[PDB]
């Protein structure tokens, strides 16, 4: 599908939402060294501006 290569950190922006409930995917949930990928079902809005002209 249409995958937008959005280079981000911490927050995943403009990504594909999960259907039904939110999903918690991890290679090893009992492992702290492996990152925890979270996928929302309802998108949250964030407005960023650079007021400097």
């Amino acid at each position, epitope marked *: 599908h249409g995958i937008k290569p959005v280079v981000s950190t911490q927050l995943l922006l403009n990504g594909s939402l999960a259907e039904e409930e939110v999903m918690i995917r991890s290679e090893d949930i*009992r*492992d*702290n*060294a492996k990152n925890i990928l979270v996928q929302f079902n309802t998108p949250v809005q964030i407005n960023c501006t650079r007021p400097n002209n």
Partner: antibody, heavy 122, light 101 residues
Framework: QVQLVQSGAEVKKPGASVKVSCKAS????????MHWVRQAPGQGLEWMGW????????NYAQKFQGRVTMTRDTSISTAYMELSRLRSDDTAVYYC???????????????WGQGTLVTVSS | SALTQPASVSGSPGQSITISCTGT?????VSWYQQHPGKAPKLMIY???NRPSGVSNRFSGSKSGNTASLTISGLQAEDEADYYC?????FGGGTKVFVLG
């Protein structure tokens, strides 16, 4: 021929802080996380936290959450471990471990340093 | 310290020995370290049974339920160190090998 060289023995007063060096050689420094495990004299090993030399992101244990600060210098391939506000129980031998090159990553420490002995004596 | 290790395990030079490591839950990997006094630990067994190069085949590992065990067949005078079992970030109490008088 993975080479791990730490700093010499340090002596600090209780309440001060100390920074422990850990120089790596013989592999790609920015490809392996760097762990820190201490052992009190006559006791067992205790994992403190790992640091990713790539981005610098660490993972301090809850016991030392707010006391230890792990940094690195990718130019010289040296990881650092600083413990603030030293208590009486902080006297231990502090090692910096590294994962196996083979077999996945991170939790099978094949390479260890010679150890750094920091002590609190009042 | 969720991993339970006996403080002392007995064995004679030549015969086998076994060090038990009892840890709760069953869904992980167990590792073993050998720490001689004055030196750093040495990875002897990774992933329950596998063994890194190049430690002798006299060391072998096993796991059944909530109990992992390290076995050393044919004990020598150089097998004298502290043995710890590892699970993720946790460590065991340690085990001293007593050879023979």
């Amino acid at each position: 021929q993975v080479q791990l060289v730490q700093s010499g023995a340090e002596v600090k007063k209780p309440g001060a802080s100390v920074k422990v060096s850990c120089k790596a050689s013989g592999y790609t420094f920015t490809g392996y996380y760097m762990h820190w495990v201490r052992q009190a004299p006559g006791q067992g090993l205790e994992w403190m936290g790992w640091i990713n030399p790539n981005s610098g992101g660490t993972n301090y244990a809850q016991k030392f959450q707010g006391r230890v600060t792990m940094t690195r210098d990718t130019s010289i391939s040296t990881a650092y471990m600083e413990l603030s506000r030293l208590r009486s129980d902080d006297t231990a031998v502090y090692y910096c471990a590294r994962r196996m090159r083979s077999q996945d990553r991170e939790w099978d420490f094949q390479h260890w340093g010679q150890g750094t002995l920091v002590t609190v004596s009042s | 310290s969720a991993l339970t290790q006996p403080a002392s395990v007995s064995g004679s030079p030549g015969q086998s020995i076994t060090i038990s490591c009892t840890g709760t839950s069953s869904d992980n990997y167990v590792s073993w370290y050998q720490q001689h006094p004055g030196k750093a630990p040495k990875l002897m067994i990774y992933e329950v049974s596998n063994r890194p190069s190049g430690v002798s085949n006299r060391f072998s590992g096993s796991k059944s339920g909530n109990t992992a065990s390290l076995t050393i067949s044919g004990l020598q005078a150089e097998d004298e160190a502290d043995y710890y079992c590892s699970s993720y970030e946790f460590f065991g109490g340690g085990t001293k090998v007593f050879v023979l008088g």
